[PDB]
Amino acid sequence: MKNIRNFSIIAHISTLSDRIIQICGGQSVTLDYKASDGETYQLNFIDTPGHVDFSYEVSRSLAACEGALLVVDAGQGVEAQTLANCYTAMEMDLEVVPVLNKIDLPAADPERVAEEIEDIVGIDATDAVRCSAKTGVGVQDVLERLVRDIPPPEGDPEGPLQALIIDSWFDNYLGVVSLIRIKNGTLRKGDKVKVMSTGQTYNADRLGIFTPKQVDRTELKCGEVGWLVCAIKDIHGAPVGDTLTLARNPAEKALPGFKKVKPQVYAGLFPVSSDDYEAFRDALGKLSLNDASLFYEPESSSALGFGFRCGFLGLLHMEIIQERLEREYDLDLITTAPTVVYEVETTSREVIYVDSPSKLPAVNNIYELREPIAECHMLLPQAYLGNVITLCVEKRGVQTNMVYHGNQVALTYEIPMAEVVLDFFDRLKSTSRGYASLDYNFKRFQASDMVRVDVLINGERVDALALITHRDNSQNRGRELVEKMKDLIPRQQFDIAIQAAIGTHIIARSTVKQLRKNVLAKCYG
């Protein structure tokens, strides 16, 4: 155990990971490093996604580490995407090792970037190892620093097994494969294992390490990271963050910090052409085999046809899947505005949760409707803050903190999730012209004057299209909706009456005029 270093990399823009592999061996790697002390160290490097959509997946990977390398471009500086992960890595007791990369570039300013790390992250950066990507010098010095500072792993190898599931995927030949950290005990080949969430037991048919090449082993001992193949049916059967133990001597308690994350953002997806339904259903199925957190459930509108109601972790989780659906499976989809999860107290005081507005209990039965609030961390040059908070309050945000970092401002606001999810990020980007970095996570539910806009077209109730929004801009969101539809619905054979209402009271009503005879229905570019 004492010669093992488990660490992850927090960076942005040959990446350091590739150069480390090159001076050792030659998503995760197990490497050997003969150090200046003449001894050999097993380096286990777990990769880290940079976005707060995968906030949980990130934290589970970090729970598998004792340290992390904060890799900053010496020619650029720090950026908020590495900040979120950096703080969580520090909240958990991980040794964060600062690295100044790309010192070779004509732009490199190491001393000033050493101040930026010290000022914004609060890590001792004065003796940070620095390294070239052109030549590769310093990478060994980084590795030496890694070995000296990151604590070795801990546990009892004879203790009852506790293996942290870092990640689980589907292999088209091997079945389900899990990347595993042995926190406690020892896992051998024959061993019959138990997944602690599910309570189900399987045989460890195969296990090994990534070299990067997939290499079989006969056991994974304490402090180690590797892969495991037992015939778990789907990746849901080995949830990320779960803990593996042995069936004959099961651990009393699972490793802390496990949860099965439920989608934060729901949306409705419908194929432009009904003929694509078969492919779309297949595409979601194919996606779901590797996406542990993608939720999808059939939904059919009168208006929009047969499609699917889908749950996502956040905006670019949705956008990754949308981009994938669009390009991999060549599907053209209509997508409804994203709607978030509300917390509602019934007249008979019970707490229920609402994904889709249509399901929200009657206005008479609601004692208190509670709205999700997102805490938004932002980095922006001083010349834009006026343009930024004016948007923040415009979206009903409340300022929680502000810190100055040279000629740069660190804003932290409390903006209603419902509103962050409806393209706020874009309006922020165009008012700061790409200079404001968003970073948000769920904070709290709060009581709020929240109403439900119902769409009906051809007098038919389109539940898929319903939205929950605040009173003060229900008139505007209803009006924008009727306009959005006028784009999706061209002038056709019949008149199409579109309207938004609150219960009985109509807020906007527009009709899409029918074509004359012998005129084809056209659409805008």
Residues 416 and 433 in one domain: yes
For 410-426, the three-class secondary structure string (H helix, E strand, C coil) is EEEEEEEHHHHHCCCHH
Dist. CA 34–CA 237, nearest whole Å: 38
The strand order across the sheet containing 28-34 reads 28-34, 40-46, 4-10, 67-73, 95-101, 129-131
Residues 13 and 66 in one domain: yes
Dist. CA 143–CA 138, nearest whole Å: 9
Cis peptide before 372 (omega within 30 of 0): no
Residues 427 and 441 in one domain: yes
CATH code where residue 31 lies: 3.40.50.300
Question: How many structural domains does the chain have?
Answer: 5
Dist. CA 225–CA 7, nearest whole Å: 11
Output the known binding site for GTP: 14-15, 101-104
Residue partners of 153: CB distance under 8 A and separation at least 6: 1, 4, 6, 66, 183, 222, 223
CATH code where residue 372 lies: 3.30.70.240
| Domain final position from 255, 276, 294 | 255
b/e 234-255 (16+ beta carbons within 10 angstroms → b): ebebbbbbbbbbbeeebbeebb
Q: What is the DSSP string of 340-385?
A: E-EEEEESS--EEEESSGGGSPPGGGEEEEEEEEEEEEEEEEGGGH
Residues 246 and 171 in one domain: yes
Residue partners of 356: CB distance under 8 A and separation at least 6: 266, 309, 339, 463, 466
Residue partners of 174: CB distance under 8 A and separation at least 6: 206, 229
Residue partners of 423: CB distance under 8 A and separation at least 6: none
**What is the helix (H) or strand (E) element at residue 155, kind and residue range?**
none
Instruction: Let me know the angle formed at the C-alpha of 145 by 140 and 150, rounded to the nearest 5 degrees.
Output: 130
Cross-strand partners of 309: 268, 297
Residue partners of 409: CB distance under 8 A and separation at least 6: 379, 380, 381, 382, 385, 402, 403
CB neighbours of residue 4 within 10 Å? 20
Q: Which two tokens stand for residue 155?
A: 């546990």
Helix (H, G, I), strand (E, B) or coil at 441: strand
Dist. CA 58–CA 3, nearest whole Å: 25
| Domain final position from 201, 222, 255 | 255
Residues 378 and 468 in one domain: no
**CA within 13 Å, CB half, 343:** 12
Cross-strand partners of 109: none
b/e 472-483 (16+ beta carbons within 10 angstroms → b): eebeebbbbbbe
Strands (E), 364-504: 366-381, 398-404, 408-416, 440-447, 450-457, 460-461, 467-470, 496-502
Resolution (A): 2.8
Nearest to 491, CA basis, from 460, 462, 522: 522
Residues 489 and 383 in one domain: no
Residue 5 DSSP label: E
| Domain final position from 337, 355, 384 | 337
Residues 282 and 246 in one domain: no
Dist. CA 393–CA 376, nearest whole Å: 13
**CA within 13 Å, CB half, 179:** 21
Q: Which residues precede gaps in the chain, with C-N > 2.5 A?
A: 13, 26
CB neighbours of residue 216 within 10 Å? 12
Residues 362 and 333 in one domain: no
As a whole number of Å, the CA-based R_g of the chain is: 26
Residues 124 and 41 in one domain: yes
Dist. CA 308–CA 270, nearest whole Å: 6
Nearest to 58, CA basis, from 441, 350, 385: 441
CB neighbours of residue 343 within 10 Å? 17
207 by Cβ neighbours in 10 Å (0-12 / 13-18 / 19+) ranks as buried
Residue 156 DSSP label: -
Q: How long a stretch of residues is the chain?
A: 525
**What is the helix (H) or strand (E) element at residue 44, kind and residue range?**
strand 40-46
Residue partners of 7: CB distance under 8 A and separation at least 6: 43, 44, 45, 46, 65, 66, 67, 68, 69, 97, 146, 150
CA distances from 387 to 344, 383, 429 (A): 34, 9, 11
CATH code where residue 507 lies: 3.30.70.2570
52 by Cβ neighbours in 10 Å (0-12 / 13-18 / 19+) ranks as buried
512 by Cβ neighbours in 10 Å (0-12 / 13-18 / 19+) ranks as middle
Do residues 161 and 244 touch, judged by C-beta distance below 8 A? yes
CATH code where residue 285 lies: 3.30.70.870
Amino acid at 19: R
Residues 205 and 268 in one domain: no
Residues 176 and 314 in one domain: no
CA distances from 445 to 168, 357, 378, 470 (A): 31, 17, 21, 14
Do residues 267 and 310 touch, judged by C-beta distance below 8 A? yes
Dist. CA 237–CA 506, nearest whole Å: 48
Do residues 295 and 310 touch, judged by C-beta distance below 8 A? yes
Structural domain span for residue 406: 338-448
Residues 26 and 97 in one domain: yes
407 by Cβ neighbours in 10 Å (0-12 / 13-18 / 19+) ranks as exposed
